[PDB]
Amino acid sequence: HVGCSVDFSKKETRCGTGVFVYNDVEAWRDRYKYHPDSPRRLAAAVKQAWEDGICGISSVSRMENIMWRSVEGELNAILEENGVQLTVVVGSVKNPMWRGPQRLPVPVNELPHGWKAWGKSYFVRAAKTNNSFVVDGDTLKECPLKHRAWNSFLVEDHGFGVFHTSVWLKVREDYSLECDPAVIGTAVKGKEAVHSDLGYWIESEKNDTWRLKRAHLIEMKTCEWPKSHTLWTDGIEESDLIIPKSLAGPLSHHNTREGYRTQMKGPWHSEELEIRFEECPGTKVHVEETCGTRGPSLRSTTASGRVIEEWCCRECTMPPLSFRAKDGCWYGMEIRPRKEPESNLVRSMVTA
Amino acid sequence: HVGCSVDFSKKETRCGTGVFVYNDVEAWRDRYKYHPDSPRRLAAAVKQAWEDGICGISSVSRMENIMWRSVEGELNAILEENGVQLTVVVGSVKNPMWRGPQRLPVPNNSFVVDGDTLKECPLKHRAWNSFLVEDHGFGVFHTSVWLKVREDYSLECDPAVIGTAVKGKEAVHSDLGYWIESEKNDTWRLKRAHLIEMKTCEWPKSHTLWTDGIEESDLIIPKSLAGPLSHHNTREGYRTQMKGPWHSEELEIRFEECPGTKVHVEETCGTRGPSLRSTTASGRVIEEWCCRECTMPPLSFRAKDGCWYGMEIRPRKEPESNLVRSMVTA
Amino acid sequence: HVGCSVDFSKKETRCGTGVFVYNDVEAWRDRYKYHPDSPRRLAAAVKQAWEDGICGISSVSRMENIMWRSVEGELNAILEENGVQLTVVVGSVKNPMWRGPQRLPVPVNELPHGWKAWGKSYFVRAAKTNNSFVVDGDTLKECPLKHRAWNSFLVEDHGFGVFHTSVWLKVREDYSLECDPAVIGTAVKGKEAVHSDLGYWIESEKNDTWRLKRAHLIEMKTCEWPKSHTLWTDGIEESDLIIPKSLAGPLSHHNTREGYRTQMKGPWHSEELEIRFEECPGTKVHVEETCGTRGPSLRSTTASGRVIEEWCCRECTMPPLSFRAKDGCWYGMEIRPRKEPESNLVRSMVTA
Amino acid sequence: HVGCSVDFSKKETRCGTGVFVYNDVEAWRDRYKYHPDSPRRLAAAVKQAWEDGICGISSVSRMENIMWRSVEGELNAILEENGVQLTVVVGSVKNPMWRGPQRLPVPNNSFVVDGDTLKECPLKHRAWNSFLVEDHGFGVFHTSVWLKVREDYSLECDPAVIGTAVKGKEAVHSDLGYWIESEKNDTWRLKRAHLIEMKTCEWPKSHTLWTDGIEESDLIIPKSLAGPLSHHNTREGYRTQMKGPWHSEELEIRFEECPGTKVHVEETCGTRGPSLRSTTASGRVIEEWCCRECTMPPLSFRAKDGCWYGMEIRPRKEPESNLVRSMVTA
């Protein structure tokens, strides 16, 4: 690729060629054309998976949710044309996106009658039948997560950053637990690294040892970060990763800091998070010795808006770990209230 | 940190912010004017080393040699100002750039700067890797590299100039003198490399991908030649190229046959050995080569004087005693 | 401003200062913070409007809708805090965005009880009330369009194109029919001009006379384009403008093309439109004097989905004008069918 | 068409695509090397004009003068090759750049190129506005402007180099030699302007804002000096500056009082007249000035040799016959 960057401090214009990594943090929210395989093969795969166990989909990320939403109507029309009584319904996504134990099989042959393109500008609206292929969205009462598909697609060719290009996908032949590597970008330049994909922006730094600076997470996935896109994959103990391995956290030493361990019981039920190492407003944390035992993450404010302004710690280091969500400001598992009892606070009820 | 980029295969362009890694090897050494933090302190360090017992300096890279050559005049003036019988003789570099077991101590008689003066003092009283780039003294928007004298003892290469990036199905492990490319073809393998210098320091693990589970016998570039300890540095059917054309000045590891030869894989072919050129000294071009268990296309080095082959590829019929060998090992 | 441009087909750059206009179309579906006056002043204005007789708000564009949507909760909380029985309900914007004959008043004196900033965290969510202050979204039967408000806000300060910035607003003192002249950018450089807005992107060119090249509309406002942001204001009549003056079309000769007149009967019900001068896929246009007179815009396809092949034009010029909506490819008022009767085609029922 | 920009008042930066208008007036004439499409055809046109009865060329802008200066030698060589008694004499321009009623026809004795040679031939047998920039011969990324010879007869300036832009509460009317700025303070008025040349052609209406409802007596920069026919070219309390310091080589119309003077609005002051400097011939500075019905701050011109005032501002007590007047009218 060819590119050119600019600095606005004083002046320079550096052009050249190489590897460029951008944020693309909200890459789901944009206009794209999605081509999940072919119109007749996807319908055949769904038809095979219907009477073979799997209820629906447990989409890995939000891009999969949008890809399914943009094609559900056409897929239903094709299924109606083939005389199959199935109806795909797509709902909202919730965090964390729990892993599914099944996958969509690749069909032997396409369905007999159908189309050849995903961009048909007119088709007859499909009717609704009894069967429902629920693609996520609060439908755990009909049938649980144990009968759902997860991580079934691979992106072959894609265009992101641009605003109208097409995205080509295909169904996995085998079962894999790792995240999609086609959309992952990892770069280092001097004393600043980054571990990014379509939903994660992890930043690292080198002050005394390579540690974690901050992280922006619009999704809480559950796949495994591929090791081919990671740095210091050796000599790491999985209990020291700030972002747990079960939440698509890199198996890297750039994901660690002194005095902290895996944040299993964090506020992963939020919609967007920012792991910042700073003190939430109106509060102070001091490294004591008689502080409480490590436990679930507690919000810095009560359920009635009152702010607890005194917290302690046992062996951690400053600045303290804190999660910034929309509802409020949270802390890590190692920081506990210094005077207030544990009962009068809101805890984190989700675990990784 | 802010910029635009375009792909010329599919006519799509975009702009944004992030991390950009550039190829600083095509326009090589006509930029990045190395100079120390203060030449006065470098003179004191050199003097302390000289009365310590260090004959001179063995340059780690070409940038260090350029720095020494540019400092030469000011260093000589500073040494002569205080009346010290010590003159710096900055010579040319000759690959590979070997390793000396000395470091500059932080503060007639000629101070060797790694020229053709091995008989003056052997490679045992010569310093090596005694310089550290200052913290904020390097950057992409920065055509003036500032240096100082290291305090500790280390073997790793300087990480302030190293840039590693991955985007999809392509990686790169690059610095001011290396440009190693990788690709995904059913596996992560080695696409090509463009080496204009051959260091001996250790590639820091901080800038490496698949550092775990790697055996130090499958890397195409040896670990003792500043090759990454990565699975991206390997390819199927090959092993470490200890005996290669490392005496050159600018190689380009290309996985294609030389223009005029053909490599046929057969069990009857010979074993591993030193790398050989495709052309004899008289100019005759050997036409046929054999390999034992490698995978086509073959591994070849594109030097200034021909097209060398890998260690696993041998001439099919012509005896190897009539071909030019490799006289340098890592 | 300071900026630097890049050219990639010619490998050359440029750096300097000046006035830069960007393609900020769809600067609503983005993450900004809105501050529509003091929280105690907006509530007092709403109360005064309800007392006078105003029962609703008609959004000028798609940004005012988001401004109301991100404010309604806090505004209702303040209203209940002050003891006022009134609730604000925000719906969805529908094209075209018609005109309301009234505007929000200046309350002079604000409400006593409340807070001072719009970023208040953890306000007690208000309870529902019988009285409703609807903001658009299918309420024409409860609060008719003649009892609504329109252009009651002015942008005082804004940062657009940079995420998480603040947008400052205030209530107009006098009634006006013009659009907001703070987000509008007009630029001409050589033989290519542009008129820009938050939802408009109109392009012109010089072949032998200045003419309309293409347009891109995501919203269809009914305000009036401010005259200070227009090129060739004089010598033009409101019968040659391709985009009608009643639909916030510039009063410029750059808005006119040879052969066509003002098109007040088009596919203005569409959510997104693109005015392109080229034939729809599979059709053909011929110029003859036997063709019919002007009328409502007709779709290239029918309700059944069959593409009409042959079309005629009376006195226009090629390439033919064409609207590119989501559901098809419409024509202008001057291009009537050649063989099929007009009664068998999907018609445009909306007039400007 | 693709680029990034930053704001230095509030630290925000953004990237995207659109129309970018640059300030090409600060770095003036050290770029955009004008040259015709083919010197041979220009030579034939000049010869045909000479036998037609055209004494020479009256330059429209500084770019045309620089083009003629650069072409002079090659044009003379081409004329001499074919044996023609005709040589071009390129001189320096003097503002204002007046208008000649002739155009070059498309195909001892000296050809005037608008020097200080009014006596050789008056401004009646001289050409003016005979050149047109070719279609793709200009661009923002294009430091080599190609020209040709016009076919028709016109009075407008060349629109290939004119850029007008509006963004919020600030506008600009600019080309290669003008930079006019506007602002919104309860109205659209004139903020400042920086003039490095004084043309005479007509500013095209294609590049003008508020072209309608404007009376040609309120424009600060007159219509006869390539001033936009816009309401952004006006301000309250002032009228057309027909008699200003238009003999200077570089002005800057700034709405601030001169450094050492004070203006008070009073009805007893004089009437409109030629512009006067703030300093006398001997260097004495007039300390008090008066205005009849204008609006503060006053209108002043910043030439290379002082600080002139507008035509509505007169000295309060010192008679106007002891001050330097303006000897040029538009």
Q: CA-CA distance, D46 to B304, in Å (whole number)?
A: 57
Residue A24 domain-assigned (yes or no): no
D2–B15: do the CB atoms touch at under 8 Å?
yes
Residue D200 domain-assigned (yes or no): yes
Give me the resolution in angstroms, 1 decimal.
3.0
C216 and C321 part of one domain = yes
A128 and A62 part of one domain = yes
Residue B85 domain-assigned (yes or no): yes
A171 and A188 part of one domain = no
DSSP-derived secondary structure letter, C315:
S
Of C97, C105, C108, residue with least CA distance to C64: C97
C210 and C340 part of one domain = yes
- Is residue B4 less than 8 Å (CB to CB) from chain C? yes
D166–C229: do the CB atoms touch at under 8 Å?
yes
Nearest-by-Cβ selection for A189 from B21, B23, B166: B21
Tokens (6 digits) for D119:
């006596």
Q: Are strands B110-112 and B288-291 parallel, antiparallel or unpaired?
A: unpaired
**Gyration radius from chain C CA atoms:** 23
Tokens (6 digits) for A80:
């109606």
**List of chain A residues whose C-beta atoms are within 8 Å of the C-beta of residue B13:** 162
Which spans in chain A are helix H?
Answer: 39-50, 62-81
CA distances for C350 relative to C242, C272, C328, angstroms: 16, 15, 17
Distance of residue C334 Cα from the nearest chain D Cα, in angstroms? 28
Q: CA-CA distance, C338 to A3, in Å (whole number)?
A: 51
Q: CA-CA distance, B181 to A245, in Å (whole number)?
A: 29
- Is residue C239 less than 8 Å (CB to CB) from chain D? no
Tokens (6 digits) for A173:
């032949």
Q: Is the dihedral of CA B271, B277, B281, B283 positive or negative?
A: positive
D114 and D172 part of one domain = no
A158 and A63 part of one domain = yes
DSSP-derived secondary structure for C62-125: HHHHHHHHTTHHHHHHHHHHTT---EEEE----SSB---SB-PPP-SS--SSS-S-TT---PPP
**List of chain D residues whose C-beta atoms are within 8 Å of the C-beta of residue C194:** 18-19
Domain final residue, candidates A145, A176, A207:
A176
Residue A23 domain-assigned (yes or no): no
Of A192, A190, A335, A172, residue with least CA distance to A266: A335
B41 and B116 part of one domain = yes
Residue type at B181 in one-letter notation: E
Q: CA-CA distance, C235 to C232, in Å (whole number)?
A: 8
The total number of residues written for chain C in this structure: 352
A15–C6: do the CB atoms touch at under 8 Å?
yes
C135 and C204 part of one domain = no
Distance of residue D16 Cα from the nearest chain B Cα, in angstroms? 6
Residue D14 domain-assigned (yes or no): no
Domain final residue, candidates B182, B201, B236:
B236
Are the C-beta atoms of residues C98 and C141 closer than 8 Å to each other?
no
Structural domain tally of chain B?
A: 3
Sheet holding A310-313, edge to edge: A284-287, A310-313, A335-337
Q: CA-CA distance, D267 to B247, in Å (whole number)?
A: 93
* Distance between start and end Cα atoms, chain C: 39
A202 and A169 part of one domain = no
Q: Provide CB contacts within 8 A for C55, sequence distance 6+.
A: C133, C134, C142, C143, C147, C148
Distance of residue C6 Cα from the nearest chain D Cα, in angstroms? 6
Give the DSSP H/E element, type plus range, for residue A133: strand A133-135
Interface size between A and D, measured as CB pairs under 8 A? 4
- Is residue B27 less than 8 Å (CB to CB) from chain D? no
D139 and D170 part of one domain = no
Residue B279 domain-assigned (yes or no): yes
B16–A161: do the CB atoms touch at under 8 Å?
yes
DSSP-derived secondary structure letter, A227:
G
Q: Which long-range contacts (CB under 8 A, 24 or more apart) does C330-333 make?
A: C330/C266, C330/C267, C330/C297, C330/C298, C330/C299, C330/C300, C331/C280, C331/C297, C331/C298, C331/C300, C332/C260, C332/C263, C332/C266, C332/C297, C333/C261, C333/C263, C333/C265, C333/C266, C333/C294, C333/C295, C333/C296, C333/C297
Helices and strands (DSSP H and E) totals, chain A: 2, 19
Residue D7 domain-assigned (yes or no): no
Residue D17 domain-assigned (yes or no): no
**List of chain A residues whose C-beta atoms are within 8 Å of the C-beta of residue B18:** 20-23, 185, 187, 194, 196
For residue D160, the enclosing domain spans: 155-236
Q: Provide CB contacts within 8 A for D190, sequence distance 6+.
A: D180, D181, D182, D220, D232, D233, D234, D235, D253, D255
Q: CA-CA distance, D181 to D190, in Å (whole number)?
A: 6
- Is residue B9 less than 8 Å (CB to CB) from chain C? no
Sheet holding C153-157, edge to edge: C33-36, C166-171, C153-157
B230 and B265 part of one domain = no
B47 and B125 part of one domain = yes
Domain final residue, candidates D149, D164, D190:
D149
Tokens (6 digits) for A244:
């747990």
